DNA sequence: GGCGACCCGGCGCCGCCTACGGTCAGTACTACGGGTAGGGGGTATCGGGCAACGCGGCACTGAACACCGTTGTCATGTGCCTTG
């Protein structure tokens, strides 16, 4: 949590370096975008021991959330081809990404 | 003011080996952009199958000489007959 706070501070100094009053709004609408950017980058870059690249990271999170949506809607484990279709990828890429998203066990 | 309690911290330990043990966890997104390790073809260099060309024993063209062996040969010596 506290490292996330520091990374948000980093995004804040970045955003205020790139803010001007020309925008006809408050700070809270401009800075928050860059804070979100910095936190997302940190969570994608230094979260996993076996580091994944950013593109694969968003692949993992998209797969996880859409799979959770499938479970919520259908209430059953969807067929691999079904998940492949909602993702539009192939089943081979599906098993690949599923294996790439594990965590080390101590 | 140093003692004194007490108070707390603070640690530190709590005995030796042996069989097997069962599993799973929630809230971004796109977009570009470079740059690649992988997909291709074509080329230069090194790495295989048949003959290569030696050698050597001996062996023959036997040729040309050598080594005994031999009956060629013979001008020159004994024995009998005729005459001094």
UniProtKB/Swiss-Prot annotation:
Q: Where is this region: Sigma-70 factor domain-2?
A: 1-49
Question: Motif Interaction with polymerase core subunit RpoC: which ranges?
Answer: 3-6
Region Sigma-70 factor domain-3, residue ranges: 58-106
Give the protein family.
Answer: Belongs to the sigma-70 factor family.
Record function comment: Sigma factors are initiation factors that promote the attachment of RNA polymerase to specific initiation sites and are then released. This sigma factor is the primary sigma factor during exponential growth. Its activity is stimulated by RbpA.
- State how it assembles: Homotrimer (Potential). interacts transiently with the RNA polymerase core complex. Interacts with RNA polymerase-binding protein RbpA via its sigma-2 region (residues 211-347) in a free form.
Name of protein: RNA polymerase principal sigma factor HrdB
Residue numbers of the full-length protein present here: 300 to 405 of 511
